[PDB]
Amino acid sequence: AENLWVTVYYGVPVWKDAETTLFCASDAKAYETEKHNVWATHACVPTDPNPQEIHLENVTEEFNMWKNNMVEQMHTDIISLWDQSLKPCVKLTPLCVTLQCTNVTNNITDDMRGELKNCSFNMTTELRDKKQKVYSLFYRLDVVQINSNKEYRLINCNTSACTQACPKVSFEPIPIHYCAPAGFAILKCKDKKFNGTGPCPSVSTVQCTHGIKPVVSTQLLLNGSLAEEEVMIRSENITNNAKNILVQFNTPVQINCTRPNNNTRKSIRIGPGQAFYATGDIIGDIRQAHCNVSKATWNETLGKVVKQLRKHFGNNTIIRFANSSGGDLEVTTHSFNCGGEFFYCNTSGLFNSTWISNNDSITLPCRIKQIINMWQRIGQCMYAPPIQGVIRCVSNITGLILTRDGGSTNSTTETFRPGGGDMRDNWRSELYKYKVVKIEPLGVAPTRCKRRV
Amino acid sequence: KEYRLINCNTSACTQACPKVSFEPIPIHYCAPAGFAILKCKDKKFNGTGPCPS
Amino acid sequence: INCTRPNNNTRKSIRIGPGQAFYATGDIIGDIRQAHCNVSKATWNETLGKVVK
Amino acid sequence: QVQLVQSGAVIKTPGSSVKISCRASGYNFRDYSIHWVRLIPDKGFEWIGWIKPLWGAVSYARQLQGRVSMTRQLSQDPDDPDWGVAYMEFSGLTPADTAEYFCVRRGSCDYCGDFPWQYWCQGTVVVVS
Amino acid sequence: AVGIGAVFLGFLGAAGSTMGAASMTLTVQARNLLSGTVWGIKQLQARVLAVERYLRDQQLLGIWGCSGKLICCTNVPWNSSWSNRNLSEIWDNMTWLQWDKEISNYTQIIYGLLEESQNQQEKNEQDLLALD
Amino acid sequence: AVGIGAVFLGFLGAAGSTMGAASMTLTVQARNLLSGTVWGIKQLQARVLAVERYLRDQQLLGIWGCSGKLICCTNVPWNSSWSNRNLSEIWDNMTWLQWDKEISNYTQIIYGLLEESQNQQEKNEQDLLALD
Amino acid sequence: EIVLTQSPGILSLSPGETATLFCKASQGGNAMTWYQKRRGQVPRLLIYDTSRRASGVPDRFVGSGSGTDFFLTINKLDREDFAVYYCQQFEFFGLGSELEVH
Amino acid sequence: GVLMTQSPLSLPVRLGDQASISCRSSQSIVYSNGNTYLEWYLQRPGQSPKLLIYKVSNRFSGVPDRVSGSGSGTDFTLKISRVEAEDLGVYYCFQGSHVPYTFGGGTKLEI
């Protein structure tokens, strides 16, 4: 009776916390169009479907979004994949050359400036002895003045030769389902009210995560995952200011964005099999690209998020907003890709408010760069191919990324500002529900049986 | 009467190295461990339908 | 064994193209001298005396 | 090693603008924040602001806005990527602004927080006529 | 619907209960432990890490008495200096997550004792067959 | 210091002695037999060659009578045409390296006989349970 | 906002006499650090976040505390160990203490 | 939760006409083998609520040839071809994906 022996049980449900690599798995609709249509047509497997998302009881694991892994390796994976869709494409060594630019044919004022420059320049042919003369159009943010005449050059041609993206491939988002291999498990906090930190009371295991699309956006993350019922804010430590504040609200705000200009692409042969898609002529009215949001829904959602912000900050507090304080281009404004072309669209018009302790729309003008320098790499650029026609796209604004000014000296106003910074804070808004655990079977337990001879 | 090569408007060309040859060689395919390869040893057999040996 | 070059160099970057840097030798400041090495006389005369034995 | 070299001390007339360049070397400059802090005599320390050089995202203290500006400059070469320069421009001078200024970096350990500094520039004396 | 009883039979679904769920679920976690151009290298090394992990556990059972029984039993008496607990309370109250921490202070004491007991018993069995 | 007796229990420490050292050390050599950008490919194929080699040996014990006992015993009589030696002189005068060469002129006669004896024993055992 | 107050403030002890400073926060839930500024030299963090001392720091400085109440115990001090001490919450700075050689 | 959003809620429906009661879920209700398990609930006042259909399009034995389900992913609409007085009262959606399941908000058929 009290002569207890021991038995080792194999396969015991128990785990620890660990860090492993994962494995992407995308749906077959990206495999309908084939042969390097977009990325993850050869990098991810087609999905084993319908994951075994079952429930679990009487259980509590502490979570963390901040020192969580699988967000680090995703920020490695997306960059590492992003490089692999460029090496089959053209390099622009023969194009960093003296330009002869002039203004586009347009009624120009003396003060306000056109954003298009009609530039002619020498170029090689397919042959080597002969050479050709050709012209294209460029925005104000890709030429600088080298120093009568007024000759320019491209901006990145003193640091890195540029890679044209192939116009065959596209940059549209696609769902990625991460999966854990055999010998691991992925938990999911199914609780409603959970600020991403501290113990979740109702976890549930899963085989593979649900749809996680990748977007690129600094302020005002787009097409995101909606909050469940309320409006939630999340942070690491709110009285610290050096960490951002993730706001995930409930109802999406529809945003329309467009370029009303009608373009033309113009193929220029550089050498054997080298095709440079420049911008041709502009048919119609030279007009400025812009975006619209709805007035009343935005004024409503700010009234929601102020009601949610006042919990952590005292009830009687004046709360205001401001434009971003400065820096480089794509952290003051907000950036996004809309059908294969990048915008940089001013957001002074959304954050001009103050909030007391008691048919129209908002237009906001954009700019269009053609070369990008995403993730701020030392040897990288990407000339975007100019796309045809009048362009527009419709999206859902889902959350914000904010930053408190942490000033000293007796503040009653707590002014807030948008800010992009790292790209990883976009990602942490999507993987806050999960963690990854490692199964360790072969437990051990005292009981009452004796093994015979 | 000046010419050009035929493929220069489509693709730059690769000279083969004169060291390597293109002569045929026997290749024996093999199945890995956990499979098998059957061979119809019949004489009069049109390649379609069941082989009896 | 001590080994040295007593000359004093300067490197000079030459941009060949985009992202290219040929680090050439700039000017030589001081006395144009020859690189050389020193070893000790007695230790070498000893260590040959060991290996002959 | 981690080295932070500032510029030299300077006499400035009242109402001018002063530039102070903190140059960092010995680490990957694109990763860590650069904070600016001041020591006024007989006041204790006083925080000024911070910058992240990856995109130049800045943030200021409250009681100095409209007067301070921060820029940065990276190293763009595959040979020597380590060194970085952070410029502070400080305008609207008063004779109370005579103090000594410091550029600092976050402590390098992973468990170290965001504010506790490890490395310090040698300090720059600013004196107003 | 699928009902409540399916998640009792689901993978890791038994983990919230006491031992009584673990007395019937042990085939499932044993089952799902095994079955799983630059990317293929990383998934290949993930797969071989998985099976190299599994075969260590089958080896570590092989050097004990339990070959593949999945519920073995052995012949070391339980020293009450570790547990200091009653019988049914660790068979009706504690969960296996809760059971993990109380035996996490000390490990390979038990495993060394099991190796010593099996290494002794095989020698005594060879001595039993030696006069046979 | 660490002493002399520690290397008796080290990896391959019993190789220099007779069988009496190797009669107890057998868990250690069994243990260390398993646990271990183009360089990743070469070490990956080394790792899978290692575990394939291990699993061939577990298979070759599986087709014999002893699954995971690690001290087998079986039922072919020792033909004295090979040994021609007294009993304890191959238990106290020889080493396993010395035992290797005296059974290296002939091999797989024994491995041929063990498969046949185990298959015959399984046949007679199937008949014994078939009448049962 | 958050107010910091060192204690006792200006102290006066001979070399060899071990001591302890104590600086009080206005409200809790946070964890302070400390600084050691010599005569006209570069300030120097000697202990971060509660009890973790930095690089190049001897273990004779031991800091502790909880609530709104944080201690810094200095033991086996030198005439060169003493300088002016500060304590920091996130960006806020106390006015400092000083331990005069008697 | 995976709570169901019902549209429309109150339907005064005349006798003989059609009726459409849709639900929209937060996630897909795709059970992990492919076969979703939806349920539509009858309810009269004074009665225990009972089943019409237990799938997207597979009904209870005893329900007449007038009630049908349709939809895919999140949008799932019930369709009654001819509405009688037996059909009046509160209707519901239901899940088969994973516990805890969510009943809806109730969709009342009236006259």
Ligand SMILES: *[C@@H]1O[C@H](CO)[C@@H](O[C@@H]2O[C@H](CO)[C@@H](O[C@@H]3O[C@H](CO[C@H]4O[C@H](CO)[C@@H](O)[C@H](O)[C@@H]4O)[C@@H](O)[C@H](O[C@H]4O[C@H](CO)[C@@H](O)[C@H](O)[C@@H]4O)[C@@H]3O)[C@H](O)[C@H]2NC(C)=O)[C@H](O)[C@H]1NC(C)=O
């Ligand atoms: C947030 O989420 C929304 C919802 O998905 C995104 O909106 C989609 O954006 C993509 C691209 O950004 C759109 O895809 C493009 O649609 C163009 C219009 O074609 C549609 O309409 C015609 C006419 O009815 C249909 O026949 C056709 O099937 C499409 O449904 C296409 O012209 C585009 O194709 C171009 O690129 C391909 C590349 O292979 C070329 O081969 C073509 O010749 C052509 O040049 C492209 O397919 C999509 O339509 C948008 N959805 C909606 C509902 O409008 C937002 O973009 C997203 N926001 C962010 C920031 O990502």
Ligand SMILES: *[C@@H]1O[C@H](CO)[C@@H](O[C@@H]2O[C@H](CO)[C@@H](O[C@@H]3O[C@H](CO)[C@@H](O)[C@H](O[C@H]4O[C@H](CO)[C@@H](O)[C@H](O)[C@@H]4O)[C@@H]3O)[C@H](O)[C@H]2NC(C)=O)[C@H](O)[C@H]1NC(C)=O
């Ligand atoms: C901002 O807020 C976050 C959370 O709101 C806070 O993160 C937490 O900080 C503590 C440090 O105070 C981290 O460390 C842990 O602390 C617990 C007790 O809370 C202990 O189990 C551990 O530390 C103990 O052991 C040490 C050994 O020497 C002792 O010296 C120490 O005093 C403790 O007794 C453990 O390390 C904790 O991990 C985080 N939380 C998370 C989720 O990461 C953060 O510190 C706040 N920022 C600032 C600047 O205060």
Ligand SMILES: *[C@@H]1O[C@H](CO)[C@@H](O[C@@H]2O[C@H](CO)[C@@H](O[C@@H]3O[C@H](CO)[C@@H](O)[C@H](O)[C@@H]3O)[C@H](O)[C@H]2NC(C)=O)[C@H](O)[C@H]1NC(C)=O
């Ligand atoms: C950008 O600048 C170039 C300058 O090289 C412009 O190209 C030239 O534009 C002029 C008029 O815009 C063209 O002249 C016209 O030619 C037609 C046909 O020969 C003739 O009928 C007209 O009377 C007039 O002479 C000229 O052909 C054209 N040259 C080339 C090589 O294209 C270009 O139009 C400018 N583009 C923009 C958008 O401003």
Ligand SMILES: *[C@@H]1O[C@H](CO)[C@@H](O[C@@H]2O[C@H](CO)[C@@H](O[C@@H]3O[C@H](CO)[C@@H](O)[C@H](O)[C@@H]3O)[C@H](O)[C@H]2NC(C)=O)[C@H](O)[C@H]1NC(C)=O
């Ligand atoms: C936040 O709001 C302020 C207030 O408008 C913005 O500051 C304004 O910035 C613009 C451009 O930076 C200033 O325009 C001026 O343009 C002339 C054109 O040559 C130039 O020479 C001047 O040096 C200056 O750049 C404008 O004066 C300035 N307003 C004030 C009151 O100083 C700020 O840009 C807004 N923030 C963002 C992120 O947009």
Ligand SMILES: *[C@@H]1O[C@H](CO)[C@@H](O[C@@H]2O[C@H](CO)[C@@H](O)[C@H](O)[C@H]2NC(C)=O)[C@H](O)[C@H]1NC(C)=O
């Ligand atoms: C072409 O563009 C240039 C540069 O934009 C114009 O030159 C000056 O432009 C600035 C602002 O764009 C004006 O304030 C100056 O008055 C312009 N100088 C002169 C002499 O015009 C130029 O005017 C544009 N148009 C032409 C026909 O060259």
Ligand SMILES: *[C@@H]1O[C@H](CO)[C@@H](O[C@@H]2O[C@H](CO)[C@@H](O)[C@H](O)[C@H]2NC(C)=O)[C@H](O)[C@H]1NC(C)=O
């Ligand atoms: C393209 O190449 C032509 C051919 O050299 C350039 O024309 C010469 O330009 C220089 C400087 O402007 C003059 O000194 C020569 O007299 C020009 N040659 C002739 C035959 O007139 C031309 O400048 C280059 N660039 C463009 C934009 O056409």
Ligand SMILES: *[C@@H]1O[C@H](CO)[C@@H](O[C@@H]2O[C@H](CO)[C@@H](O)[C@H](O)[C@H]2NC(C)=O)[C@H](O)[C@H]1NC(C)=O
């Ligand atoms: C997120 O919520 C959790 C719990 O709901 C908070 O964790 C506790 O918060 C209280 C009050 O702030 C502290 O007294 C406890 O010590 C916290 N628990 C732990 C383990 O530290 C957490 O503060 C919330 N975070 C945010 C940013 O709101």
Ligand SMILES: *[C@@H]1O[C@H](CO)[C@@H](O[C@@H]2O[C@H](CO)[C@@H](O)[C@H](O)[C@H]2NC(C)=O)[C@H](O)[C@H]1NC(C)=O
């Ligand atoms: C943008 O410009 C192109 C220029 O080609 C327009 O395409 C022409 O459209 C008209 C009317 O549909 C057709 O008759 C022509 O045959 C088209 N041209 C070609 C080359 O196909 C296009 O319609 C314009 N789009 C907008 C929105 O203005």
Ligand SMILES: *[C@@H]1O[C@H](CO)[C@@H](O[C@@H]2O[C@H](CO)[C@@H](O)[C@H](O)[C@H]2NC(C)=O)[C@H](O)[C@H]1NC(C)=O
């Ligand atoms: C963004 O653009 C879309 C274009 O489809 C707008 O949707 C339609 O807008 C018209 C306005 O003339 C309405 O009459 C339609 O009913 C809308 N369609 C739908 C399905 O609602 C959308 O309203 C625009 N949003 C904003 C804020 O301007």
Ligand SMILES: *[C@@H]1O[C@H](CO)[C@@H](O[C@@H]2O[C@H](CO)[C@@H](O)[C@H](O)[C@H]2NC(C)=O)[C@H](O)[C@H]1NC(C)=O
């Ligand atoms: C973003 O929008 C704001 C508001 O439209 C711009 O601020 C205006 O800038 C002009 C200078 O071009 C001034 O004359 C106006 O007085 C400014 N408006 C206000 C309300 O102060 C701002 O310039 C835009 N951002 C950028 C980068 O141009």
Ligand SMILES: *[C@@H]1O[C@H](CO)[C@@H](O[C@@H]2O[C@H](CO)[C@@H](O)[C@H](O)[C@H]2NC(C)=O)[C@H](O)[C@H]1NC(C)=O
């Ligand atoms: C933005 O969010 C809205 C939220 O309603 C989405 O609208 C619904 O999306 C589902 C999913 O395909 C459709 O079945 C519904 O018909 C949509 N309802 C309405 C009223 O449009 C919308 O799809 C999201 N995306 C965009 C680009 O607007």
Ligand SMILES: *[C@@H]1O[C@H](CO)[C@@H](O[C@@H]2O[C@H](CO)[C@@H](O)[C@H](O)[C@H]2NC(C)=O)[C@H](O)[C@H]1NC(C)=O
């Ligand atoms: C080799 O030449 C360099 C030339 O710069 C010498 O560096 C200078 O050394 C003097 C002596 O202290 C300094 O005053 C200068 O400031 C240095 N120049 C620079 C640019 O830093 C170097 O000393 C010479 N080597 C030797 C051994 O004398």
Ligand SMILES: *[C@@H]1O[C@H](CO)[C@@H](O[C@@H]2O[C@H](CO)[C@@H](O)[C@H](O)[C@H]2NC(C)=O)[C@H](O)[C@H]1NC(C)=O
């Ligand atoms: C090689 O160079 C080293 C440089 O340190 C010499 O070491 C020192 O040389 C000086 C000669 O002026 C001696 O006085 C020191 O005592 C040496 N240091 C030590 C630690 O012995 C070394 O002697 C040189 N070797 C030869 C063979 O010249």
Ligand SMILES: *[C@@H]1O[C@H](CO)[C@@H](O)[C@H](O)[C@H]1NC(C)=O
């Ligand atoms: C490239 O040119 C721009 C414009 O003159 C200049 O600001 C930048 O410093 C240059 N880059 C380098 C690496 O010199």
Ligand SMILES: *[C@@H]1O[C@H](CO)[C@@H](O)[C@H](O)[C@H]1NC(C)=O
């Ligand atoms: C290349 O040149 C030949 C000869 O003129 C021509 O037939 C062919 O169409 C050209 N290729 C292309 C892609 O135009």
